[PDB]
């Protein structure tokens, strides 16, 4: 709620980024192989921005990616319902 679904998104975005590099390293060609841009990629994913920078190529990397989508889009189906509520409320007054 208040800042709860928020925190869960950040667990996802970290552990996601961390595991993406683990799964993708070893696949010849993967760009998703350093902890920085891995993190950026998990934001590119939770928010469905689909910029086209990074994406996974391994099976497990794609599973990790799907977990981020779900756990992100849901978080962000709620973080965005809450920033809308709080500031729109106080700012609407």
């Amino acid at each position: 709620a208040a800042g709860a679904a928020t925190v869960l998104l950040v667990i996802v975005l970290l552990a996601g980024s961390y595991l993406a590099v683990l799964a993708e390293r070893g696949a010849p060609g993967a760009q998703l192989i350093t902890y920085p841009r891995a993190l950026w990629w998990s934001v590119e994913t939770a928010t469905t921005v689909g910029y086209g920078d990074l994406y996974p190529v391994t099976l497990w990397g794609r599973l990790v990616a799907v977990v981020v989508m779900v756990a992100g889009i849901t978080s962000f189906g709620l973080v965005t319902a809450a920033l809308a509520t709080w500031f729109v409320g106080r700012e609407q007054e």
Partner: antibody, heavy 117, light 108 residues
Framework: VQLQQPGAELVKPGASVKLSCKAS????????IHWVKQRPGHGLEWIGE????????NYNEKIQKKATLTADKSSSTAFMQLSSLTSEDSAVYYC???????????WGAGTTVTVSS | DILLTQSPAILSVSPGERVSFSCRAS??????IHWYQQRTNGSPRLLIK???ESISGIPSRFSGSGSGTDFTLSINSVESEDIANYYC?????????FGSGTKLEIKR
């Protein structure tokens, strides 16, 4: 001395050998340990990486996969086992500490391996 | 397996004059290049990271240039302590790769 590896080894041809890399300093969860091969008067051949904390290793696709990587999660020392060597396998062997950002911040002194009877 | 191609192989130069080793990749890698110096008998030593960023504890002579596929290690001046092999190494796509290496020779 951050990364620390022995000076020199000698291997009978066809035999095996283990290589050490005790690393004082930090021991981050996110650390990776790499190994680079330098044949005499050659460049740097990346052999393979290992993340010691979690435990998975990845080897060089393109070379004869002669080795396998291991670690000691609470001795801060990582290992590389080279099995059944020839004279093509005699070189200097560095270990490196990639932080997870994609460069080899820290280099060991290198272990010189000579495969002779 | 991204191919780094360091030309030229050797580099003549008189002391104090600017020098530039070119690295050139087999496809775009953005800025994920890093330069390593390695003198005789010694281990490699990170010089420039991410193609432009300096390393603390590195002389200001070393200047990182380049992006995309054309990369340029540069030394704004030269002195005798800079003789070594020099290596580029990309971290943009797995596996990490290295260049063929460039040695620096001083005409004196």
């Amino acid at each position: 001395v951050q990364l620390q590896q022995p000076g020199a080894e000698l291997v009978k041809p066809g035999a095996s050998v283990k290589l050490s890399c005790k690393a004082s300093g930090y021991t981050f969860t996110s650390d990776w340990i790499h190994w680079v091969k330098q044949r005499p008067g050659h460049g740097l051949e990346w052999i393979g990486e290992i993340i010691p904390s979690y435990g998975r290793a990845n080897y060089n696709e393109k070379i004869q996969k002669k080795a396998t990587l291991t670690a000691d999660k609470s001795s801060s020392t990582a290992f590389m086992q080279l099995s059944s060597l020839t004279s093509e396998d005699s070189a200097v062997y560095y270990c490196a500490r990639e932080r997870g950002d994609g460069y080899f911040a820290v280099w060991g002194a290198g272990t010189t391996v000579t495969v002779s009877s | 397996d991204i191919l780094l191609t360091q030309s030229p192989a050797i580099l003549s130069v008189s002391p104090g004059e600017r020098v530039s080793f070119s690295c050139r990749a087999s496809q775009s890698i953005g800025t994920d290049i890093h330069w390593y110096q390695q003198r005789t008998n010694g281990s490699p030593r990170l010089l420039i990271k991410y193609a432009s960023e300096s390393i603390s504890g590195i002389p200001s002579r070393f200047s990182g240039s380049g992006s995309g596929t054309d990369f340029t290690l540069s030394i704004n001046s030269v002195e005798s302590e800079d003789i070594a092999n020099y290596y580029c190494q990309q971290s943009n796509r797995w596996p990490f790769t290295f260049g063929s290496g460039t040695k620096l020779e001083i005409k004196r």
